[PDB]
Amino acid sequence: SGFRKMAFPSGKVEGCMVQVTCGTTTLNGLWLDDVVYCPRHVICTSEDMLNPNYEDLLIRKSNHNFLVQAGNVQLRVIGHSMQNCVLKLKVDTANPKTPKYKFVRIQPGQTFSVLACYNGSPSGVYQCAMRPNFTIKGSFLNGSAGSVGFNIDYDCVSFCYMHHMELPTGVHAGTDLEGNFYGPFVDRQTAQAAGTDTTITVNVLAWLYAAVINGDRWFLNRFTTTLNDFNLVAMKYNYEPLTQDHVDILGPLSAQTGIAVLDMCASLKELLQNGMNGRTILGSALLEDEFTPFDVVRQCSGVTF
């Protein structure tokens, strides 16, 4: 038993991180097959970053203007192009540590593992969630741009995030591996604020199911509710709406604990209105929303990769 903020094993991703240098700007790159992916603002100077024209900044650059280091080995750049906010650098050597992978764009509320990197060297890994406002409450310092988020679906690494920048509120923003930003942000050093964030209701319910599996049952009650009645108070407390899809994906947990999904919503409903009454759930005094239903299943049944 026990329940922890659990990231995926990061070994297959570690062997893909490289360092990319363009002038005095350094960040991290993802070396997959014979292409290195990295944030396009690596071509910016410190003075270029206010209102850069990435179209114009890239035209003046050639292949050898990019220094790609895989450890103590320098990779030779034989091509370059830009796809949205990421730069693709073709190299003359395919990464022999290339795992089975694909690029996937995740929905808000879905979780992933971040491999924080500095100077192309992996330094830490942590689990986080795409917030409904499309920010990430990460832990990132200067030089962490190019770090990636990923999931492991069966035997395949699904890259879903590449880090770019930190908002003035200290939360973080980035793109998928195809360069498309998550959320209404742009890669330039201007004032940018996110929309109001909300709690991922389906994840909280999954986390309450994990607590019941671990014997934490004080929050259960005799009551049930309905989707319409729950969503009325959920919207009032800045909670994401609960759909029939969320109820369905919670099915395996509802049958395994013998607790109906809508019975659990009545528990969560009472917790929003009355609080926790001085108690904790799985060692937390907050309603945790960074565990998806599948996150609970893979941890509590010991799924391996």
Binding site: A145, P168, D187, Q192
Partner: peptide, 10 residues
């Protein structure tokens, strides 16, 4: 404040 592109400088 403004957004900080979290590259590094040499």
């Amino acid at each position: 404040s403004a957004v900080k592109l979290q590259n590094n400088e040499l």
